[PDB]
């Protein structure tokens, strides 16, 4: 497996190698290879069901395959069929995967939980719903023993002990060691998860007759060694404090025949473990570092129980995107009770009514049309066929996500239109070799933010097109309702207004929040048009929540470095919260070290709460305006979040 963005689709094109398709062709080939390819494809599907959906290519080995005649041939878990959409190109099978929709409670998509469990007679793996319930419940035999201590066991002595919740008979295979190592994780996991029961290797399970193995190949020493190894190597988890170890006991019940010993019956007694025990790491995957990565048992078990954090501590908050109706990688979104919900923000920033085609930014489309001549003609030409939708403009859409603005890009237009794929229009003053690259990367990052961060469950593709002002998805991906583009815009409001809140990242895992109208206004303002601004006093964290994003914008637009964005803030909690952040935004230095040091290379400066600047320290405004105006490249930006 790998991850390829080189494909025309602006998505996560997992290259799953070459498969051999066709049901009959599946039946008439190597079953080992069939299972290998099926497992690889399901690996890729489980990877894309978490990461945010994408594509799976496959170089078909079958010459003359046809998706209408020969079928597919893939054996797929039943829950992994509501998401896959298959397709064929002349020599490439494609499988388009949407998100996971956190359907039926389970947060992430799992192939198999590998949390075995023993029912009345059989050891079955807990499905994802059972495993989630089982973790949620652990977080919040005298007769078989008498048999266990028995010394003499004669051949074919029919045991009075029947298979039950606490016993299990497993006959010996050809290789006793290989078979016991293959079966021990299973039964040990089963017993530890359940009330805890014994297991006897070497005795038939239905007739319950002592058989054992021949002594010529078995060695009790190496057997016990391998058993304790493969029993302590089991990936376990622990919701408790002591963190004990798997407390088992092993015994070799003797085996006699006509008064002559001929083998043993490996009797293993596993006690009820206080925490979950796996047979190996869960078979769940994701796409990380642009490759496939198996979620670690600790992260798997802390993700399956990543319930929406209890907002009972702060009864003033209100939840708006629960993780029970979102994607795997989404986070909840709480808003103050008085601040507007997600629905009002959607209907205010991106209205939807089918009588015409409107523009989300009236002032951005207007100023762009009053400045550039011909932009109005190009937009009215491209926007002519579509009758219902909304065209949204942004001085450069790559910046509103977090990417890096390019040179020679007039503006970016996204059109949300029902009954057709949403279309991204990127308008260039001049054609070059970066048109396609920039458009595809902006569209790909936009879809990723809409799915992962925004939490869009249904199918979503953003079609990128470039126009110099001077592929094909299946029918499923084409919108079909006016009640799903409403979901797309309720997710876009989150993508363009969501920030990782600081108030509640102590209240749980992590909880996003929504900027007000004034903060998004002051953020959307063009920097290359306004390199100097004095902001009215912002109540509460106004300036901080805004500055932490204005600095990312400053780094992206001006191609500046984090080391050239000075952040002059006084309060020490602000200093630690901004500096010790993992993203390395700026250099928070107080007013004292501001005027007690020389900044030779600082280009952009953002000041916080100039109301506390003492005059005896020095006339800060002159020095600041000097160091910005005389910056290395051009007049630097100067934002003073005074009150
Ligand atoms: Zn424990």
């Amino acid at each position: 497996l790998r991850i390829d963005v080189d494909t025309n689709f602006p998505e996560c094109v997992v290259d799953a190698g070459k498969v051999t398709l066709g049901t009959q062709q599946r039946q008439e080939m190597d079953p080992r290879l069939r299972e290998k390819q099926n497992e690889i494809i399901l690996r890729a599907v489980c990877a894309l069901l978490n990461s945010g959906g994408g594509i799976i290519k496959a170089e078909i080995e079958n010459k003359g395959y046809n998706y209408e005649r020969h079928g597919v041939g893939l054996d797929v878990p039943p829950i992994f069929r509501s998401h896959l959409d298959k397709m064929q190109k002349e020599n490439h099978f494609l499988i388009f995967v949407k998100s996971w929709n956190t359907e039926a409670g389970v947060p992430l998509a799992t192939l198999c939980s590998n949390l075995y469990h023993r029912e009345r007679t059989s050891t079955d793996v807990m499905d994802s719903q059972e495993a989630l319930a089982f973790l949620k419940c652990r977080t919040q035999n005298v007769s078989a023993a008498a048999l266990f201590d028995r010394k003499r066991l004669q051949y074919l002595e029919k045991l009075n002990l029947p298979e039950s919740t606490h016993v299990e008979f497993v006959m010996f295979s050809t290789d006793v060691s290989h078979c016991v190592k293959d079966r021990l994780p299973k039964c040990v996991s089963a017993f530890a998860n359940t009330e805890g029961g014994y297991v006897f290797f070497g005795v038939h399970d239905e007739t319950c007759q002592v058989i054992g193995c021949e002594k010529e190949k078995i060695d009790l020493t190496s057997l016990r060694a391998s058993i304790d190894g493969c029993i302590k190597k089991l990936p376990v988890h622990h919701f408790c404090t002591q963190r004990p170890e798997i407390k088992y006991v092993l015994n070799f019940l003797e085996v006699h025949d006509k008064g002559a010993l001929r083998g043993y019956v490996c009797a293993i007694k596993v006690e009820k473990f206080c925490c979950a025990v796996f047979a190996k790491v869960p078979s769940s995957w994701q796409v990380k570092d642009n490759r496939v990565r198996q979620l670690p048992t600790r992260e798997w078990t802390a993700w399956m129980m990543e319930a929406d954090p209890d907002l009972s501590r702060c009864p003033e908050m209100v939840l708006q995107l629960s993780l029970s109706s979102a994607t795997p990688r989404s986070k909840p979104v709480c808003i103050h009770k008085n601040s507007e919900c997600l629905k009002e923000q959607q209907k205010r920033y991106f209205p939807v009514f089918s009588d015409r085609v409107v523009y989300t930014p009236e002032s951005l489309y207007k100023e762009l049309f009053s400045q550039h001549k011909g932009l109005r003609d190009l937009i009215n030409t491209e926007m002519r066929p579509f009758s219902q939708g909304i065209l949204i403009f942004s001085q450069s859409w790559a910046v509103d996500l977090g990417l890096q603005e390019k040179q020679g890009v007039i503006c970016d237009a996204l059109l949300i239109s029902q009954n057709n794929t949403p279309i991204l229009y990127t308008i260039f003053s001049k054609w070059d070799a970066g048109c396609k690259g920039y458009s595809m990367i902006v569209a790909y990052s936009l879809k990723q933010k809409l799915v992962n961060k925004g939490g869009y469950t249904g199918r979503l593709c953003i079609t990128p097109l470039v126009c110099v002002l001077n592929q094909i998805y299946p029918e499923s991906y084409n919108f079909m309702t006016p009640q799903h583009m409403e979901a797309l815009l309720q997710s876009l409001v989150i993508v363009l207004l969501g920030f990782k809140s600081f108030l509640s990242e102590e209240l749980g895992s992590e909880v996003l929040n929504l900027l007000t109208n004034k903060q998004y206004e002051l953020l959307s303002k063009n920097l290359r048009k306004t390199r100097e601004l004095f902001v009215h006093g912002l109540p509460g964290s106004g300036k901080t929540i805004l500055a932490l994003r204005i600095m990312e914008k400053i780094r992206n637009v001006f191609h500046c470095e984090p080391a050239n964005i000075l952040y002059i803030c006084e309060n020490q909690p602000l200093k630690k919260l901004v500096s010790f952040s993992k993203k390395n935004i700026c250099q928070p230095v107080t007013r004292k070290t501001f005027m007690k040091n020389n900044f030779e290379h600082i280009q952009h400066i953002i000041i916080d709460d100039a109301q506390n600047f003492r005059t005896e320290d020095g006339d800060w405004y002159g020095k600041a305006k000097f160091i910005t105006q005389t910056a290395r490249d051009g007049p630097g930006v100067l934002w003073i979040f005074l009150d």
Side-chain angles (χ1 to χ4, degrees):
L1 290 161
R2 68 186 276 107
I3 303 301
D4 279 332
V5 188
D6 52 27
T7 317
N8 295 178
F9 306 101
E11 278 161 313
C12 320
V13 180
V14 179
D15 186 301
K18 51 186 192 313
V19 291
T20 301
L21 294 202
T23 80
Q24 214 168 29
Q25 269 61 31
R26 300 308 273 271
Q27 311 315 97
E28 58 207 339
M29 69 171 179
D30 194 11
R32 307 274 297 189
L33 166 56
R34 159 167 78 254
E35 175 48 45
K36 171 178 289 187
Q37 291 171 351
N38 198 327
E39 163 66 18
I40 294 179
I41 301 303
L42 293 178
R43 275 184 188 156
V45 172
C46 189
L48 299 182
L49 276 152
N50 313 308
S51 312
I55 313 301
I56 308 188
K57 290 189 70 65
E59 181 97 21
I60 293 191
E61 268 184 14
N62 300 109
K63 325 300 181 303
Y65 164 92
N66 171 273
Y67 174 58
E68 287 323 280
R69 293 178 36 199
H70 295 207
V72 285
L74 284 194
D75 199 1
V76 167
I79 307 294
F80 289 178
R81 291 174 294 101
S82 167
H83 303 305
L84 271 62
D85 309 324
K86 302 184 186 65
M87 178 180 286
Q88 168 190 359
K89 302 295 187 291
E90 69 274 16
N91 48 355
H92 286 258
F93 196 82
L94 313 187
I95 297 163
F96 303 180
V97 192
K98 54 183 281 289
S99 43
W100 168 255
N101 193 20
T102 196
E103 182 178 1
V106 61
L108 63 88
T110 309
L111 284 176
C112 64
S113 192
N114 270 321
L115 281 177
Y116 283 48
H117 166 67
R118 190 147 171 102
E119 282 300 339
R120 293 182 187 180
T121 310
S122 281
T123 52
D124 58 358
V125 55
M126 292 186 150
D127 74 326
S128 312
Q129 293 88 359
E130 273 178 336
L132 161 65
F134 164 65
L135 299 184
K136 270 282 182 174
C137 278
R138 285 186 181 271
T139 293
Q140 70 92 25
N141 193 329
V142 63
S143 324
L147 164 64
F148 184 79
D149 299 67
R150 267 189 58 192
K151 310 307 183 64
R152 299 289 187 271
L153 264 67
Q154 177 62 23
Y155 202 52
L156 266 290
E157 279 186 347
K158 176 189 176 59
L159 291 67
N160 52 355
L161 181 54
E163 285 175 298
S164 316
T165 318
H166 301 90
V167 187
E168 159 175 336
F169 298 83
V170 179
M171 260 285 317
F172 278 148
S173 312
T174 61
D175 177 338
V176 59
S177 44
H178 173 98
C179 174
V180 62
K181 278 175 277 303
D182 273 18
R183 281 299 312 271
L184 270 178
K186 308 187 168 49
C187 47
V188 166
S189 317
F191 289 130
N193 292 211
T194 201
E195 310 311 328
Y198 330 157
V199 54
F200 300 70
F201 289 74
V203 175
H204 189 278
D205 81 321
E206 182 39 36
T207 76
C208 319
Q209 296 158 350
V210 182
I211 304 293
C213 76
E214 184 37 70
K215 313 162 301 301
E216 63 165 30
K217 179 261 161 162
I218 188 49
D219 169 72
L220 304 177
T221 76
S222 45
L223 182 46
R224 183 182 271 272
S226 42
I227 287 178
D228 65 60
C230 317
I231 280 189
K232 291 307 181 279
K233 191 184 288 185
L234 300 185
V236 302
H237 192 257
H238 267 286
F239 312 97
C240 71
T241 66
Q242 169 55 47
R243 321 308 182 84
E245 195 175 31
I246 300 157
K247 184 61 187 309
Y248 83 100
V249 178
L250 197 145
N251 184 10
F252 291 125
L253 274 54
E254 194 176 60
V255 160
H256 272 262
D257 211 320
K258 324 161 300 302
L261 195 171
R262 286 179 62 250
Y264 302 85
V265 186
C266 288
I268 293 170
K269 177 182 293 181
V270 182
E271 196 78 75
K272 167 134 183 182
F273 206 78
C274 312
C275 297
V277 177
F278 300 72
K280 30 193 180 189
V281 297
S283 276
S284 178
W285 309 75
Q286 79 173 353
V287 169
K288 194 80 169 308
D289 190 1
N290 289 9
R291 73 181 192 274
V292 286
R293 179 179 183 270
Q294 182 154 16
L295 272 163
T297 64
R298 57 188 188 277
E299 178 72 4
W300 190 97
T301 53
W303 202 349
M304 297 273 303
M305 317 156 47
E306 191 212 358
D308 73 81
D310 272 358
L311 308 187
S312 43
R313 302 174 185 167
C314 199
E316 193 65 19
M317 282 312 200
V318 179
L319 190 46
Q320 295 286 350
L321 178 70
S322 178
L323 197 53
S324 82
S325 158
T327 59
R329 285 195 166 174
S330 166
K331 324 292 191 181
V333 168
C334 62
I335 294 91
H336 183 211
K337 175 73 151 93
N338 314 339
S339 183
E340 290 321 303
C341 53
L342 192 60
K343 211 141 180 183
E344 305 300 85
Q345 278 184 21
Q346 186 275 336
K347 291 162 50 190
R348 174 168 175 178
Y349 286 15
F350 311 99
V352 169
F353 50 95
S354 45
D355 69 6
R356 76 189 197 98
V357 168
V358 199
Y359 309 93
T360 275
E362 59 302 336
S363 178
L364 185 36
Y365 100 89
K366 281 161 196 175
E367 194 290 328
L368 280 167
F369 284 165
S370 312
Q371 205 292 322
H372 293 270
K373 262 65 63 181
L375 203 71
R376 187 190 308 274
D377 271 18
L378 201 57
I379 292 302
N380 299 331
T381 289
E382 298 276 57
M383 198 64 237
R384 204 56 183 267
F386 319 108
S387 198
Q388 163 204 345
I390 188 165
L391 188 46
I392 71 201
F393 293 92
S394 169
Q395 192 65 252
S396 198
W397 205 272
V399 162
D400 289 358
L401 313 186
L403 284 174
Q404 200 171 2
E405 183 179 1
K406 214 194 184 66
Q407 58 270 5
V409 193
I410 308 171
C411 82
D412 275 331
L414 190 87
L415 158 66
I416 296 289
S417 180
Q418 178 208 339
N419 294 146
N420 192 31
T421 64
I423 202 156
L424 166 72
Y425 287 137
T426 177
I427 309 166
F428 281 19
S429 292
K430 187 55 205 78
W431 190 97
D432 52 356
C435 296
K436 177 182 155 199
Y438 172 83
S439 44
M440 278 170 59
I441 296 183
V442 168
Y444 164 74
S445 199
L446 181 51
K447 155 175 163 275
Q448 287 306 324
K449 292 251 164 192
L450 272 176
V451 171
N452 298 350
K453 157 158 182 184
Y456 187 73
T457 67
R459 278 188 202 73
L460 175 60
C461 79
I462 301 296
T463 47
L465 278 182
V466 64
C467 49
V468 194
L469 160 70
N470 48 3
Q471 298 179 198
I472 289 192
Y473 289 112
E475 179 68 20
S476 304
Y477 272 111
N478 298 14
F479 270 35
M480 296 179 78
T481 79
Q483 279 288 29
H484 268 253
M485 71 179 283
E486 197 149 71
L488 201 53
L489 305 194
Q490 288 222 18
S491 177
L492 200 78
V493 163
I494 284 171
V495 172
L496 299 203
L497 279 81
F499 68 95
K500 289 79 203 173
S501 88
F502 326 113
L503 182 145
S504 287
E505 277 184 38
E506 54 84 18
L507 187 141
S509 84
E510 167 184 341
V511 165
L512 314 187
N513 205 3
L514 295 202
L515 298 177
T516 80
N517 62 86
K518 307 95 185 175
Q519 294 182 49
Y520 196 49
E521 173 185 6
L522 297 151
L523 200 166
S524 42
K525 281 194 177 176
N526 196 3
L527 297 173
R528 294 185 173 272
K529 184 84 62 168
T530 308
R531 307 166 166 265
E532 187 270 349
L533 185 44
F534 283 48
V535 184
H536 308 268
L538 319 79
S541 295
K543 69 169 188 303
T544 168
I545 306 147
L546 172 56
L548 284 145
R549 272 146 89 79
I550 206 73
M551 277 185 168
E552 319 174 342
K553 188 173 176 66
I554 283 168
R555 172 195 38 190
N556 282 308
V557 190
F558 301 79
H559 310 260
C560 170
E561 195 67 26
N564 311 138
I565 314 163
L566 216 53
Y567 180 60
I568 304 158
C569 79
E570 306 277 8
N571 172 272
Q572 183 38 34
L574 321 184
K575 296 191 51 187
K576 54 205 80 183
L577 185 144
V578 179
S579 44
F580 273 20
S581 181
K582 54 213 81 183
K583 288 150 305 309
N584 175 237
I585 283 176
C586 48
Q587 295 178 353
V589 307
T590 188
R591 159 203 47 77
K592 305 190 308 304
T593 174
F594 171 48
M595 293 304 300
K596 298 330 180 52
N597 200 295
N598 204 27
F599 310 106
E600 193 195 330
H601 55 298
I602 290 301
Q603 327 192 333
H604 320 295
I605 284 178
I606 312 294
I607 304 182
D608 284 25
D609 193 8
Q611 204 144 320
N612 61 59
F613 263 52
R614 277 306 311 122
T615 76
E616 51 274 1
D617 180 326
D619 46 13
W620 52 274
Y621 182 28
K623 322 280 170 51
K625 208 171 180 182
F626 165 78
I627 186 169
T628 75
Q629 281 176 0
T630 76
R632 186 144 312 282
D633 300 74
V637 303
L638 171 66
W639 291 62
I640 307 165
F641 292 123
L642 57 82
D643 184 78

